[PDB]
Design a protein around this ligand. Structure first.
Ligand SMILES: CCCCCC(=O)OC[C@@H](COP(=O)(O)OCCN)OC(=O)CCCCC
Ligand SMILES: CCCCCC(=O)OC[C@@H](COP(=O)(O)OCCN)OC(=O)CCCCC
Ligand SMILES: CCCCCC(=O)OC[C@@H](CO)OC(=O)CCCCC
Ligand SMILES: CCCCCC(=O)OC[C@@H](CO)OC(=O)CCCCC
Ligand SMILES: *[C@@H]1O[C@H](CO)[C@@H](O)[C@H](O)[C@H]1NC(C)=O
Lengths: 494, 115, 160, 104
């Protein structure tokens, strides 16, 4: 309630944020005092008369120090390895042997999983750590299938692009390039499964939950780009099948190169030199090239479950979340200089050394590649005399190259302020609040009670510790007041 | 104020370029007595207003107009600094940018000497 | 590795018709994406000879995303490096350097009635205990005097 | 007066700047203590017998913490929206709809 009033008031902003820290530190100071395991398992989930209810409620409210405390981390660790229990302290080599064995034996697991009530290995496979290793192994085999599909071209293509080659003269050429191979079928089976899982999650979570997380939308967009590329490939396959069914019926010749064809069916004999600039094949290759680059961003689901690459990712996410405020300001200066450079050089399309600045797309291109030191000075020079125009061009291009460096400098220095603000004992805490969230993705699927006695004992210990610290915070004043009251009795008696 | 003055100077140069072409048109429409302006050659002062951009004099009012008008459009997007402080997200950004730009010039004067 | 696999899958069919020989095999795509981080690469590896402008625009877009991503990663590296200097603080570089050189020196050095040693060690431990008790007593001066004058006021109440 | 003597002396530079901080912190510490709205509207403009006279005089002298205090910011915000009063807490989408309607 306090953390939501802080975003609505905005003038008493610091006061509600000062009160929320007291509301969190009360809970952390209560958590400290627990000694037996019954008190920890009475705090972390509520009155029962697993199911980690208070921990799942402290994820939503983002109380980072309640989850990053050791008395909660050991209770989560005894669930994360709940049947292995010897792997809890082993080297990374033994852990890599495990993921290699499971990644090898992935297709044996369903056969071992319908057995699972009759098997001790069935219960030893239904642990959170084995579910995590199984999902990671499946996603690694996916990338392996993509790279192996890309194979047989690793050292060049073997022919030239304008030359055609077929198995037999009768076969039309356009069939052989667009037909499917066995690995693309497995890609088609795999994409549909990930689309199905995201379809189930969206229906239950709702649009607001999908919209709230930027990462969910990135995943869903990657799946949609895959589906669009394969639909374009199938539309390219159907027309070649139609042309083959035409030719094999009405050919009445020895070879398809002998007698010329009607000109619509003639188009499916050409090589890549003469394809129409909107071919379904070309659209398929472009979208399929985008999707493979987007499909290696899924390793961010894997990386927080590791100590060495853990706090790295969090700082990378913070800097990427802090770039965009600078990026919006950089777009304005970029747009100003590109509109000015376009208005200047637009009448000189015929007479320039370079083709730069003569249209909006090309001016965008030159001003974008000029910030990476991959541009020429000789885009500014022209062929006629008109030296006033050329000097104004040099001056504006120099002002642009200075302004981008200044903006860049400002960005770096503002980034330093965040590190000073971070201080100490937070990266360790922030990283812990990452990994536990990941772990909680897999856990799923009169006479007073005992609970109230335990809670009464905890609150009594908290009150006693607070009074002891308050008494030892000021020692001399009570003794001076007592000896003043004793001097009062000494004055009364004497 | 300088941005406004550069705009005014560019449009005055454009108007000076327009007046002489009106004078040449009033000459030709009076004393032409032909079917087309490409048929009979003209006196050589009026002949100059038939050329394309390959043969213009290197101080033409048109060229001066295009140059100053290209400077003024770049300067006229710096007016968004009147808008940006009335926003929480882009607010403290601008202030740090103004501080760094105010602190560059002391280094710039020392860099000019070595250059 | 992500960007080199994507750039190889895109331009692999155009080996015969390009301006530059880049991206047409895995070794050459590795070469171009490695030398592009040192500003020693061309834009004209992306352009090709045919029309197929969809392919060329996807090439420009992916190459621009790569050149932005490397700078962001580089920026993150530099800022994380600063955290270590703040963590280092003071009176440690001098100490760390000394622990270097002494290690180097130790590479060359090679090739009833109690003893005297126990008397020396007993004297040292006695001095440590005495210094610790003096510092603990001077850590809180007023409380002992207040307790003493309270106990004296107890005797003054007993006598009066 | 102290902040102008600091630029004329330049050898006792730090002393006049140390005194100007006391002259500013007195005003901020007085501003803190006001409880009712009549005390805030008695400090922010002077004796009348809007017209934000002390705030317009604290812009000239650059006393940043007297203007950046919340008890002044709420009085300025109740003038900045003085007839709208429902737009004071809305999303940025509703604000962009307003500027699009007015720009049309
Ligand atoms: C370096 C990339 C690997 C990503 C995952 C990772 O770092 O985790 C390492 C371990 C899992 O960690 P643990 O739970 O055993 O704890 C590590 C203790 N510091 O095992 C894994 O989770 C690895 C699964 C990958 C096998 C295909
Ligand atoms: C991103 C560039 C916009 C510049 C102005 C700006 O950020 O202000 C946003 C609001 C004005 O802000 P408010 O007074 O409503 O307060 C914002 C509360 N954080 O509305 C405006 O002032 C915008 C006016 C522009 C419409 C043409
Ligand atoms: C001042 C007059 C310059 C004369 C124009 C000429 O022939 O080249 C000089 C021009 C091009 O390099 O200089 C610049 O790059 C300007 C940089 C300004 C930095 C804020
Ligand atoms: C957006 C559409 C671009 C059109 C493609 C074209 O012809 O060139 C533009 C392309 C190449 O420079 O732009 C880039 O470099 C993209 C950088 C994106 C930064 C995240
Ligand atoms: C294909 O292109 C090459 C390019 O050098 C050319 O030599 C060859 O003649 C072309 N073949 C056809 C059939 O056009």
């Amino acid at each position: 309630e306090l953390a939501k009033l802080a975003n609505i008031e905005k003038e008493f902003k610091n006061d509600y944020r000062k009160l929320s820290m007291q509301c969190k530190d009360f809970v952390v100071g209560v958590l400290d005092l627990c000694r037996d395991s019954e008190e920890v398992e009475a705090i972390l989930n509520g009155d029962l008369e697993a199911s980690l209810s208070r921990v799942k409620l402290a994820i939503k409210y983002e109380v980072k120090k309640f989850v990053a405390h050791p008395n909660c981390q050991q209770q989560l660790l005894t669930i994360w390895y709940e049947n292995l229990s010897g792997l809890r302290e082993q080297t990374i080599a033994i852990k890599c042997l495990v993921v290699l064995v499971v990644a090898l034996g992935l297709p044996f697991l369903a056969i071992g999983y319908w057995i699972a009530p009759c098997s001790r290995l069935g219960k030893i496979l239904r642990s959170p750590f084995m579910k995590f290793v199984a999902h990671a192994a499946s996603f690694i085999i996916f990338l392996g299938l993509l790279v192996f599909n890309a194979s047989d071209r690793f050292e060049g293509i073997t022919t030239l692009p304008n030359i055609t080659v077929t198995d037999y003269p009768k076969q039309i050429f356009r069939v052989k390039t667009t037909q499917f191979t066995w690995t693309e079928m497995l890609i088609m089976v795999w994409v549909l499964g990930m689309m199905w899982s995201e379809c189930k999650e969206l229906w239950l979570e709702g649009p607001r939950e999908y919209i709230l997380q930027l990462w969910n939308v990135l995943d869903f967009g990657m799946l949609s780009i895959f589906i669009a590329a394969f639909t374009a490939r199938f539309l390219a396959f159907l027309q070649a099948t139609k042309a083959q069914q035409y030719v094999d019926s009405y050919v009445q010749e020895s070879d398809l190169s002998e007698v010329t064809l009607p000109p619509e069916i003639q188009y499916f004999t050409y090589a890549r030199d003469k394809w129409l600039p909107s071919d379904p094949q070309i659209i398929s290759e472009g979208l399929y090239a985008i999707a493979v680059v987007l499909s290696f961003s899924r390793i961010a689901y894997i990386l927080p479950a590791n100590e060495s690459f853990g706090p790295l990712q969090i700082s990378l996410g913070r800097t990427v979340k802090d770039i965009f405020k600078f990026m919006v300001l950089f777009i304005m200066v970029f747009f100003a200089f590109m509109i000015g450079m376009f208005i200047l050089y637009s009448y000189y399309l015929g007479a320039k050394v370079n083709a730069a600045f003569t249209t909006v797309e090309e001016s965008f291109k030159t001003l974008f590649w000029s910030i990476f030191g991959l541009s020429e000075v000789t885009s500014v020079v022209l062929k006629y005399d008109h030296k006033f125009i050329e000097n104004i061009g040099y001056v504006l291009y120099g002002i642009y190259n200075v302004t981008m460096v200044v903006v860049l400098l400002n960005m770096l220095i503002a980034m330093i302020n965040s590190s000073y603000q971070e201080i100490e004992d937070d990266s360790d805490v922030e990283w812990k609040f990452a990994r536990s969230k990941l772990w909680l993705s897999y856990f799923d699927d009169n006479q007073p009670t005992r609970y109230q006695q335990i809670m009464k004992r905890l609150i009594k210990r908290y009150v006693l510790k607070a009074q002891v610290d308050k008494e030892n915070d000021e020692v001399n004043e009570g003794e001076l007041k007592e000896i003043k009251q004793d001097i009062s009795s000494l004055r009364y008696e004497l």
